[PDB]
RNA sequence: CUUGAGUCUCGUAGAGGGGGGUAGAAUUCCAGGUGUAGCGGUGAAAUGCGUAGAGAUCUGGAGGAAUACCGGUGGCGAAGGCGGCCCCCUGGACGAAGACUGACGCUCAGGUGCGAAAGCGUGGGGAGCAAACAGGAUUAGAUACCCUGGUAGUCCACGCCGUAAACGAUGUCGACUUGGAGGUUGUGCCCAGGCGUGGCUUCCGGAGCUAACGCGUUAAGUCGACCGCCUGGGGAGUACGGCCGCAAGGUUAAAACUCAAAUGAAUUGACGGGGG
């Protein structure tokens, strides 16, 4: 999991304030570093299976918010996926 | 990360203990490492034969240490056959009270 | 040269009992089955053919001269008791009665079931 | 002592078994088939082979039938076998043929 | 299990000290267990056999008041 | 439970006087049926005793 | 908009997963010491092993595989499954109080992944066990059941295979509807004990449901959303074609023909090399 100071970090770049925990941005935020952080953990670790599962869950849950982000307000989506650096 | 490590050293060898005792808690404290306890129960009867021994030297050491010292505490343990067994276990908070030796 | 204290190895298996009475740093002396004492087949499987065999056994141990015994079982079989209380019988002192059953903590797979 | 080991050469020769087959007088070709790979594989062992016919109920009163089965087998195994007892009569409801190796 | 022979106790006495050792250790029922292999769904079965047994008897006594 | 009245929060692998009180003459572990131990401190008990038993403060088998 | 669904903070339990190390016990083997005629095996035997010294006992070594006791209708996991101890990397669940986002949800044809054991490919390894196989028996026969051996395999790495009575023979998600006795894991309050409140789980049973057996707040009850599937027995999960696979084969899936049944539960007998 992403420490109590990285998630802080995050909470207050992302965040419109440090209480602002629940935004679409934030959470986006938090799962994008720990995707990226777990790509180091299966590239050693191939046949991890039942770790991978919830890594494909954080995957999907990101998706699906994104998508939601997209049509609730499009300004704010490509924001978002030029910061994080994601294509889609 | 709050670790915890017992070793055995042969009998024989038990005026190294004050020795490796310093050399240990050396590489601790020159990584920003706390000793939290240590103690030296001495020799005492061992339940079945280690190699052989009937007796073995027991030293406790509470410790909080950035990973990788304790990684070469471990690599030193191995190859100083003096050493007869080793444990480095973890804790969630700091031992500082005596054990009952 | 006389001994005075040994010790008596029973094996006790379920088709045979073995005897062999050693000194104490188990250098054997002299044994006795219950295959060697007439019994065969499912005969030296008894109480009986071990205590014949125990009798068998503390007449080699004669000319050592032993008083005293430690007692070494080992085995499920029918010869456990009987062995014992025909050595005490022999006129040896038992010490010490000590099962050494091996058990693996676990170790290796056992043979097929017998389908009969 | 032992001696044992000699027993053991002594015994690497051999000790002939009387095999048992029984046929019938209706027996079909499969199953006759069948029991005659059982004789020549005694026969190749070296071993005798009490070869029987039974009869139940009125079958005794065609006994020319049994007849020809044991004929038969004796045929078959003429090259293999040499006959020792070949039947004259039912005794019981039965026929006895005993053939033996070559 | 071992059984030191006490100062003026007869052979009787302590062979009988030696089965109840014996018996309390179970030595014997582990080398009969450990005979023949036993496949882990044979295990299961026997397992959940006993328990539904010893379940059973507790409801039948008190199921008599 | 002697753990729940006293209020333990972890059995030490180093209390060989309390952890001989939980193994046999042969030295095996005792079940918690007979003890009348939790089944929470039942676990950490055992692991004790296994932890014991590496560092030869108590022995595996009563024939070593 | 906050009630569904999420995010954050503090804690708790766990054989959840991946990697590395290590401990004790046992089997086999090797090398010595003591010792001497048996061992081993069965219903009964024999094959086999032993005077080139076995088996037994003791000491030392070698190697592989699996973790007694704890251990539990105990626990964790989507399922398959997961059990010595220690470290490293890592997934999910649950509780308490708040704060935050603001319907972001539920289900899913095609698709994609995971998937016991056996099996396949290429390299390793090989104690014990053991298809095939070899010998010894039993028998009317005995290509078996029993005995002595024993190769693939079982183990490791990487790839393939994609099936099982893969079962709760019970699809996923949500709401509602009397009780009793337990287990396991949190938590509040009062004073260990007492009184509440969550999660998971085992057994009984009420209404209701059901052909019956039974199920019964963990529904097979009362409802709503979406998916999968059935349409007499055999022929047949077979043929042909397609797709997949190194192969073994898997998957999708008919028809002619033939029969008047096949089937589920329960009832009364009789029967059992079932019990009392
Ligand atoms: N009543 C009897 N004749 C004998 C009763 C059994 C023997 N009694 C014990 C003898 C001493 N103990 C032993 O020897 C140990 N056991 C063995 O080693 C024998 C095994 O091999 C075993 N399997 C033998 C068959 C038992 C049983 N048969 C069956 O049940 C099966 C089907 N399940 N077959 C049949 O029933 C028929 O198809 C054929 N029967 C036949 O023709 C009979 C067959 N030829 C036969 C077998 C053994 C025998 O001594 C004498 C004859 C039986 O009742 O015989
Ligand atoms: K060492
Ligand atoms: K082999
Ligand atoms: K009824
Ligand atoms: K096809
Ligand atoms: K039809
Ligand atoms: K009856
Ligand atoms: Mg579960
Ligand atoms: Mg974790
Ligand atoms: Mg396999
Ligand atoms: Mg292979
Ligand atoms: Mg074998
Ligand atoms: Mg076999
Ligand atoms: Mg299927
Ligand atoms: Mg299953
Ligand atoms: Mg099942
Ligand atoms: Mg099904
Ligand atoms: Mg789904
Ligand atoms: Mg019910
Ligand atoms: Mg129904
Ligand atoms: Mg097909």
Not at chain 3, 15 to 35: E, K, P, Y
Not at chain 5, 20 to 30: H, I, Q
Not at chain 5, 38 to 57: F, G, L, N, Q, W
Not at chain 6, 21 to 42: F, L, W
Request: glycine share 6%; aromatic share 6%.
């Amino acid at each position: 999991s992403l420490s109590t100071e990285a998630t802080a970090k995050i909470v207050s770049e992302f965040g419109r304030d440090a209480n602002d925990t629940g935004s679409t941005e934030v959470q986006v935020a938090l799962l994008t570093a720990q995707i990226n952080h777990l790509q180091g953990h299966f590239a050693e670790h191939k046949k991890d299976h039942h770790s991978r599962r919830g890594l494909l869950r954080m995957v999907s849950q990101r998706r699906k918010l994104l998508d939601y982000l997209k049509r609730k307000d499009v300004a704010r989506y490509t924001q978002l996926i030029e910061r994080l650096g994601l294509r889609r | 990360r709050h670790y915890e490590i017992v070793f055995m050293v042969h009998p024989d060898q038990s005026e190294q203990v004050p020795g490796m005792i310093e050399r240990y808690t050396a590489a601790i404290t020159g990584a920003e490492g706390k000793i939290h306890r240590l103690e030296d129960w001495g020799r005492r009867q061992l339940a079945y034969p280690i190699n052989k021994l009937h007796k073995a030297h027991y030293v406790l050491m509470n410790v909080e240490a950035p990973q990788e010292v304790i990684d070469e505490l471990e690599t030193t343990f191995r190859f100083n056959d003096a050493v007869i067994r080793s444990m480095v276990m973890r804790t969630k908070h700091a031992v500082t009270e005596a054990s009952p030796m | 040269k006389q001994v005075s204290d040994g010790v008596a190895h029973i094996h006790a298996s379920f088709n045979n009992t073995i005897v062999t009475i050693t000194d104490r740093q188990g250098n054997a002396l002299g044994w006795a089955t219950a295959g060697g004492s007439g019994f065969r087949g499912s005969r030296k499987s008894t109480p009986f053919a071990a205590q014949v065999a125990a009798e068998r056994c503390a007449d080699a141990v004669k000319e050592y001269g032993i008083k005293n015994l430690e007692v070494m079982v080992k085995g499920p079989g029918p010869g456990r008791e009987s062995t014992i209380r025909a050595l005490n019988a022999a006129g040896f002192r038992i010490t010490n009665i000590t099962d050494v059953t091996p058990i693996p903590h676990x170790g290796c797979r056992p043979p097929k079931k017998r389908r009969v | 002592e032992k001696s044992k080991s000699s027993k053991e050469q002594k015994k690497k020769q051999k000790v002939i078994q009387v095999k048992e087959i029984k046929f019938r007088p209706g027996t079909d070709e499969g199953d006759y088939q069948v029991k005659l790979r059982s004789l020549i594989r005694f026969l190749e062992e070296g071993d005798k082979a009490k070869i029987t016919l039974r009869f139940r109920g009125r079958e005794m009163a065609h006994q020319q039938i049994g007849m020809e089965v044991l004929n038969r087998v004796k045929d078959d195994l003429q090259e293999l076998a040499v006959v020792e007892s070949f039947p004259t009569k039912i005794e019981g409801r039965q026929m006895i043929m005993v053939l033996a190796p070559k | 299990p071992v059984i030191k022979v006490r100062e003026n106790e007869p052979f009787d006495v302590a062979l009988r000290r030696f089965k109840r050792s014996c018996e309390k250790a179970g030595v014997l029922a582990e080398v009969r267990r450990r005979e023949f292999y036993e496949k882990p769904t044979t295990e299961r079965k026997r397992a959940k056999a006993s328990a539904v047994k010893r379940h059973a008897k507790k409801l039948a006594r008190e199921n008599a008041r | 439970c002697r753990f729940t009245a006293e209020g333990v929060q972890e059995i030490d692998y180093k209390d060989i006087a309390t952890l001989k009180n939980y193994i046999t003459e042969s030295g095996k572990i005792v079940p918690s049926r007979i003890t009348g131990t939790r089944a929470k401190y039942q676990r950490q008990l055992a692991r004790a005793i296994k932890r014991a038993r590496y560092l030869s403060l108590l022995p595996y088998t009563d024939r070593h």
